[PDB]
Amino acid sequence: SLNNLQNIIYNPVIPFVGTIPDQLDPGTLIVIRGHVPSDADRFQVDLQNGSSMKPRADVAFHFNPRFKRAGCIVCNTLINEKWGREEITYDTPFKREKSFEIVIMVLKDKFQVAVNGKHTLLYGHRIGPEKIDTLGIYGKVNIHSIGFSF
């Protein structure tokens, strides 16, 4: 499953913005390992069409764990600097002060996300995955490694 994983970024400064080195075709994996700090309110993993900041680049897949109250994961898409319809997942595996491994698997019609070896959620494509060339990681999170399996 991770036998083809190639980690290429270690302990990046957050915020991290980096070009994805290949097209996110079906079967592609994005693997992100790190920690949630004790004071974390939220962090996000954004799969972006480009790295523009002004105006803000479209986010095909916003994967946004939030830790207040019982915690959740918000997923959404940003187009023309505007958010679409939120898909909220309340069964979240993330915890402050806990390590994690996020595996984002890119499928034909959706993303399938597993955390710590366990399925977490699905997100149907709203932007064609071929337009995704940039990985952004923002917020209160510590990242040990970013890798890809194409």
Ligand X SMILES: CC(=O)N[C@@H]1[C@@H](O)[C@H](O[C@@H]2O[C@H](CO)[C@H](O)[C@H](O)[C@H]2O)[C@@H](CO)O[C@H]1O
Q: What residues are designated binding site for a carbohydrate?
A: 66, 76, 86
DSSP assignment of 32-81? EEEE--TT--BEEEEEEES--TTTTPEEEEEEEEE-STT-EEEEEEEETT
Long-range (24+ apart) CB contacts under 8 A made by 108-112 are 108/26, 111/61
Write the single-letter amino acid at 66. R
Least Cβ distance, residue 64 to ligand X (angstroms): 5
Binder of ligand X out of 28, 64, 89, 149 (CB under 6 A): 64
Least Cβ distance, residue 59 to ligand X (angstroms): 9
**76 touches ligand X by CB under 6 A:** yes
Tokens for 29, please give them: 């994996």
Nearer to ligand X, 48 or 64 (CB): 64
**86 touches ligand X by CB under 6 A:** yes
Chain residues binding ligand X by CB under 6 A are 62, 64, 74, 76, 83, 86
